[PDB]
Amino acid sequence: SDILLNRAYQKRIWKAIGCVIYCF
Amino acid sequence: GSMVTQIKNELSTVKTTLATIEGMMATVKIMDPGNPTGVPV
Amino acid sequence: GSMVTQIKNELSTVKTTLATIEGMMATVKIMDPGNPTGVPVDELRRSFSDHVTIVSGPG
Amino acid sequence: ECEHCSSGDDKFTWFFLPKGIRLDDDPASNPPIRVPYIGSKTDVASMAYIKGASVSLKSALRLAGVYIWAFGDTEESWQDAYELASTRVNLTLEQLQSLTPLPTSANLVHRKFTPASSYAFSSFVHISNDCQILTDSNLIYQQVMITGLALIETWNNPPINFSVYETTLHLHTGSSCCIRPVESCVVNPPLLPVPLINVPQMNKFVYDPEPLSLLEMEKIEDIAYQTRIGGLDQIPLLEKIPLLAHLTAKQMVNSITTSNWISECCYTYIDSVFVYSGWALLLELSYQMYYLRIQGIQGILDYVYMTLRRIPGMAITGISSTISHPRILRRCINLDVIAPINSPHIASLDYTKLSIDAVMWGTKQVLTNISQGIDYEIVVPSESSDRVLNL
Amino acid sequence: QYTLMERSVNPMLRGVFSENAAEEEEELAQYLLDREVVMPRVAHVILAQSSCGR
Amino acid sequence: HLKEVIEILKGQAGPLGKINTILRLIVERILMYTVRNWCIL
Amino acid sequence: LNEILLPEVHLNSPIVRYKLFYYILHGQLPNDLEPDDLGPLANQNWKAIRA
Amino acid sequence: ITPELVALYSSEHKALTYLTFEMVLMVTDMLEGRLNVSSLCTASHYLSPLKKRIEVLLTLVDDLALLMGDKVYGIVSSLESFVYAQLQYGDPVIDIKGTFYGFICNEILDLLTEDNIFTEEEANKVLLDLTSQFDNLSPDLTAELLCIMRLWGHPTLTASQAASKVRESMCAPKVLDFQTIMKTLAFFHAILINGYRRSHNGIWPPTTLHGNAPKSLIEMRHDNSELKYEYVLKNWKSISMLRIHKCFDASPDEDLSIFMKDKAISCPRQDWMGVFRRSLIKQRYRDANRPLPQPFNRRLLLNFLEDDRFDPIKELEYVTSGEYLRDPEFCASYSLKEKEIKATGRIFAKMTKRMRSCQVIAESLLANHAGKLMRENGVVLDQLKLTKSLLTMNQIGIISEHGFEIAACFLTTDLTKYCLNWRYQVIIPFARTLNSMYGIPHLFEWIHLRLMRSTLYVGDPFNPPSDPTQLDLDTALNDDIFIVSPRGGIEGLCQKLWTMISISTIILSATEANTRVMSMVQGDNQAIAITTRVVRSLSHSEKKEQAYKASKLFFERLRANNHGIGHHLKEQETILSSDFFIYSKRVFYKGRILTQALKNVSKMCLTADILGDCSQASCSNLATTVMRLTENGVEKDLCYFLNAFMTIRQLCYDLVFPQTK
Ligand SMILES: [Zn+2]
Ligand SMILES: [Zn+2]
């Protein structure tokens, strides 16, 4: 059930992680 | 008695195949242009 | 229970033939003679002029 | 650069033909194809819908609706329409008034294979009236779109089979003398008495002595009494807008579970539209989530998210079209319903995912408000039973 | 069509034909048209959905 | 949300495409759950 | 009244070969028609028909 | 020039010809069409490439006409299909490219060498000359070479020759498959039930399950659930033999417009010779010592109008009671059809007043209640959504780059000879179930039953029977102008039932091959868009090859089914293409409808056929044809100029050629 992530998806995920860290 | 059951279950298949044969023969008979047929009601 | 067993095997023989007849009946051919001879209709008129209300299949 | 856009005028129907089209060539190379705009025929919202209505009954209803829309809605304007319908039916005045469709914006439409064009280059053409007002106006704008398509098609005549450059047609209808305002539906009483109209009472093809059954008469009487007492739009103006939002949300939910709702959504509360969309979808999925033993608000939210994500993209195109409209898009952005994310340009936005996000926001709002205790009204259209007990 | 309609004696179309049908249609068109504002579209529709128009 | 997956899997043993899209949606939802709650991990 | 019910201006009826054969045999018009070409018209007593 | 004949002689060729009035009208219509087509090809830059090719085609087929005679219209009708054969000569699929082209070339060779007018070498040379005018043209122009069809006039018609074709399609032995009939009947029942579910608030019709129905069918009837076609194909022995009871409260007098349309009615059988010219039959009647038959001139409309006691229920009682099969007055006859060049369809039939009224009532009953229930095909009365559906059907396989994709292979079938090939034994079950649904004991199986008991004939006033001793229709033999006991149906008559059967057969064949299709059956031409799933990354040629390979099984199943219900499908009728299909004589080529403007310009004449013959009517007709020209790709500037020019031309013609002094 593992899924793959496109490069833009990776940028999305890492930016979201940054946003979560910044806000939490 | 079990023998009976199987026989009832298998006679169900006999029923359905006999009904299929009956309907098929009815359709055949009603397919003769020689004798015009009318649908009931 | 034995008589009912004799009829148990014999009925299985019936089941199979009924299946077989159905097979052939399902593959029959409905043929229309047509008027190849070209006989005057007067002569060819050997057919009912009257509808018959016979029930086919269910009814 | 367009000379009408550059000088004051701003109303137009935008046409676009992409570059790189080669007919009778590889479909992959040329831009995507689509069924062009070939016309829009008649497409009633009456007080009560009658099933199996006779031709005479339909004709009488048409006559009464047109009469009331055109000449007025006084009591004598209703008496004259009732008499003229009585030349073709046998209904009494009360059921006539009740069954007659809405006397608002009457279309007045009145009455082998010949295609209007080859649809060669018109199948690749983009059309958008986003810079236009929009039932004479509807016919006018359909005519404008057809004229633009035919102009694009005659720009590349059948001798021409290629498009090495992308072309744009503006077709500005604004700043035009011909377009005019519309004023009608005044009260004009008849300056002449009603003529002695001979009527073929016995002829079934002209007059129907019994156009309504006893059950139909009972149902129409019940509907009229319920409207007179329970009411329909007697509610104040402050209550109509949320009710319109609720009704259009129910329509959207029934659609998902060129058709659009921009006309309604531009004149209602878009945040309330999506809130009631979430409420209606929750009502639809309540039994399914109950049989799956879902617990907690987040369980409902996850279930509705996956349900929205699993519907085909063609089904949600109705909501997509409404949200994609620039005015509705800006409204949704300003009400925090919609955030344009993960797209360099607005036109590249995933409007299907955007609509799913809007419905999810509405569902979350409904769940939170229910948890805090803010009850939400349930509407039961086509009911004056057991379906209300089910709802 | 008038020559066949006035000749018709069929049970259907028993009352369709009227000798003063033209006069009745003129009176009805006057009723719809002899108003403060003339609306030929409305008159055409109402005539076409009236008994004379049928 | 794997109940539908197991139901179709048992029914067939078309459906595989539905199986894959449901699995992808579930895993993506789990991924956003993780990203949203990344700090407390 | 015949000035309203004018003959057809365009074709609306099938072309019949035996109509032309009838009109060219009625007047004994010159022709190279074989006996089978005429079909049933060859057996007619054109004398009475001409009379 | 005489009122009856025109004697034309040319000293240059030393040729003398005689033209009757009808032939004079044909020649002047055909020459006007030639002038219009040639002048439009000269004028329009779009049609400019076609001028030389049309000229050479006209010259070659004119010399061929001089050489053969009336058989050159066979060559013309072959060119009619050779247009499509050349159109499918450029499809990506190798296994479908050139099949129709080669077969039509073979058929033209057969038509040229049947009478031994041309030897094999000469016939091949003539075929090459005919074909060379079709090659190296754009698809649009190859379709606009379908204007030439009426550019060579129409054949001289004879009753015997026209009767021979229908006497052979009918009156011929035809073997049918019981199972194929029962499978298509089961799918017919399934489609009827599904349509009645899609209407009437999603509930099954009143139905009575047979004794062979399984438990699953009993539960689906009880739950009022949709019958999936895969289920029907499995249990077809119970989906059939399923009696649908009365569903519609249909009445014969539901529609009045049907009764007020004039249809040709035949004379009573006792006087059937009154159609023929009095001169030809006078002597043969004198030698038999019998009175001359009374001429018949009544019309259906006038007869219906002048009935003091006319009840449509009593009209339908003619068929329902069985009186039609006993009426000694009943008489049906054909008559030569105008403006047709093909051997088939050269006649149309006329019946008696009571049986024409019964036929129109039955057709109205079918078209209003049961015909509405099957919409597996896309044809509807609304032309706008019809052409929208046609465009959507044609654009199935056209996907751009803006995984898996979709691919389409289109099949077009001609159903012209279907009417003659329908047999009672293959339609009786459908007729019986329709009778049950409508409540009528016996209505819809009337055409074949009445035809097998009556002798038909072709009624032409100048075509009397060859034998003068055959003065009664019943004793007539199966030769000359007679068709004794035709077992088949007549064109147009009971077409709704035949169309519904064809739709059921198409759906059965699609389900048997596990292939999605979108039929567009229309009575004459049916179009099927076979759909399959292909890899997106695949090449276009390979995508179309995969689509054709998927469509191969469906086409085989459709051929087998049509042969089972008695319609043998030949190479002429079917047209398999990965690019286009044909609907209503218009081709849908790669998301386009090809122009065929020359066909419209060929019928732009100098007067309207209406009786008043005003200048306004003629100018309006010209304007309508110019509108068609604008819609069919001709330059709009040229169309405007042409409209003004021919309006001026028509007014000047009416001024200088006054109809009345
Ligand atoms: Zn502009
Ligand atoms: Zn103006």
Helix (H, G, I), strand (E, B) or coil at H162: helix
Helix (H, G, I), strand (E, B) or coil at G47: helix
Query: What is the rounded distance in angstroms from the CA atom of residue D21 to the CA atom of residue D32?
Result: 9
Q: Which of H179, H475, H566 is closest, CB to CB, to C42?
A: H475
Query: What is the rounded distance in angstroms from the CA atom of residue D118 to the CA atom of residue H633?
Result: 7
Query: How far, in Å, from the CA of D12 to the mean position of ligand 1?
Result: 6
Helices (H), chain A: 7-23
Helices (H), H336-466: 353-365, 383-394, 418-421, 424-438, 447-451
Cα angle H370, H373, H379; round to 5: 105
Cα angle D26, D32, D34; round to 5: 115
Query: What is the rounded distance in angstroms from the CA atom of residue H187 to the CA atom of residue H231?
Result: 10
The HSE-up count of residue H367 (CA atoms within 13 Å, CB side) is: 18
The answer to whether the CB atoms of H178 and C37 lie below 8 A apart is no
Query: Contact H604/H625 with Cβ under 8 angstroms?
Result: yes
Among residues H343, H280, H333, H332, which one has the least CA distance to residue G18?
Answer: H280
Structure tokens at H570: 């030949």
The HSE-up count of residue D49 (CA atoms within 13 Å, CB side) is: 6
Structure tokens at D31: 């831009």
Query: What is the rounded distance in angstroms from the CA atom of residue D51 to the CA atom of residue H4?
Result: 61
Structure tokens at H531: 């759909």
Q: Which residues of F touch A1 (CB under 8 A)?
A: 23, 26-27
Strand partners, H6: H19
Query: Contact H199/H591 with Cβ under 8 angstroms?
Result: no
Q: What number of other Cβ atoms are within 10 A of residue B41's Cβ? A: 14
Helix axes D351-372, D297-310, angle to 10 degrees: 160
Which residues 270-289 of H are in CB contact (within 8 Å) with G?
Answer: 277, 279-280, 282-283
**CB-based contacts of D48: which residues, under 8 Å, 6+ apart?**
D98, D99, D219, D220, D223
Place of tokens 């369980």: D299
Distance from CA of C57 to the nearest CA of B (A): 5
- Please give, one letter per residue, the 3-state secondary structure of D115-172: CCCCCCCHHHCEEECCCCCCCHHHHHHHHHHHHHHHHHHHHCCCCCCEECCCEEECCC
DSSP, res H351: B
Query: Contact H308/H116 with Cβ under 8 angstroms?
Result: no
Strand partners, H528: H411, H519
Strand partners, H17: H8
H/E element holding H301? helix H300-305
Query: What is the rounded distance in angstroms from the CA atom of residue D193 to the CA atom of residue E30?
Result: 10
**CB-based contacts of H295: which residues, under 8 Å, 6+ apart?**
H274, H278
Q: What number of other Cβ atoms are within 10 A of residue H38's Cβ? A: 18
The answer to whether the CB atoms of A2 and F27 lie below 8 A apart is yes
Among residues B20, B15, B19, B25, which one has the least CA distance to residue C11?
Answer: B15
The answer to whether the CB atoms of H388 and D38 lie below 8 A apart is yes
Helix axes B2-29, C3-26, angle to 10 degrees: 30
| Reported resolution, Å | 2.9
Place of tokens 């009109």: G23
Query: Contact H173/G31 with Cβ under 8 angstroms?
Result: no
Asked if F31 has any chain A CB less than 8 Å from its own CB, the reply is yes
H/E element holding H408? strand H404-414
Query: What is the rounded distance in angstroms from the CA atom of residue C24 to the CA atom of residue H220?
Result: 29
Query: How far, in Å, from the CA of D173 to the mean position of ligand 2?
Result: 10
Query: What is the rounded distance in angstroms from the CA atom of residue C22 to the CA atom of residue B27?
Result: 14
Of all residues in chain H, the one with the smallest CA distance to E5 is H305
Among residues D226, D227, D282, which one has the least CA distance to residue D250?
Answer: D282
Query: Contact D88/E51 with Cβ under 8 angstroms?
Result: yes
Query: What is the rounded distance in angstroms from the CA atom of residue H511 to the CA atom of residue H186?
Result: 12
Distance, C-alpha D358 to centroid of its chain: 21
Distance, C-alpha C2 to centroid of its chain: 36
Query: What is the rounded distance in angstroms from the CA atom of residue H283 to the CA atom of residue H320?
Result: 42
Query: What is the rounded distance in angstroms from the CA atom of residue E54 to the CA atom of residue D203?
Result: 11
Query: Contact H605/H215 with Cβ under 8 angstroms?
Result: no
Distance, C-alpha H186 to centroid of its chain: 27
Distance from CA of D124 to the nearest CA of H (A): 10
Query: Contact H40/H626 with Cβ under 8 angstroms?
Result: no
- D13 to D5, D38, D149, H109, H576: CA distances (angstroms): 12, 16, 11, 56, 41
Give residue D260's identity as a one-letter amino acid code.
N
Q: What number of other Cβ atoms are within 10 A of residue D333's Cβ? A: 13
- Listed in order, strand segments (DSSP E) in H22-155 are none
Q: Which of H29, H155, H468 is closest, CB to CB, to G11?
A: H29
Q: What number of other Cβ atoms are within 10 A of residue H192's Cβ? A: 25
Interface test with F, best of D291, D295, D302, D311 (most F CBs within 10 A): D302
H/E element holding D16? strand D14-17
Query: What is the rounded distance in angstroms from the CA atom of residue D295 to the CA atom of residue D284?
Result: 17
Handedness of CA H532, H533, H536, H541 (dihedral sign): negative
Query: Contact D119/D36 with Cβ under 8 angstroms?
Result: yes
Of all residues in chain B, the one with the smallest CA distance to H214 is B16
Query: What is the rounded distance in angstroms from the CA atom of residue D172 to the CA atom of residue D169?
Result: 9
Query: What is the rounded distance in angstroms from the CA atom of residue H54 to the CA atom of residue H64?
Result: 15
Among residues H26, H114, H44, H47, which one has the least CA distance to residue H74?
Answer: H114
Distance, C-alpha H474 to centroid of its chain: 30
Query: Contact H413/H325 with Cβ under 8 angstroms?
Result: no
DSSP, residue by residue, D229-241: HT-SS-S-HHHHH
**CB-based contacts of D157: which residues, under 8 Å, 6+ apart?**
H46, H633, H635
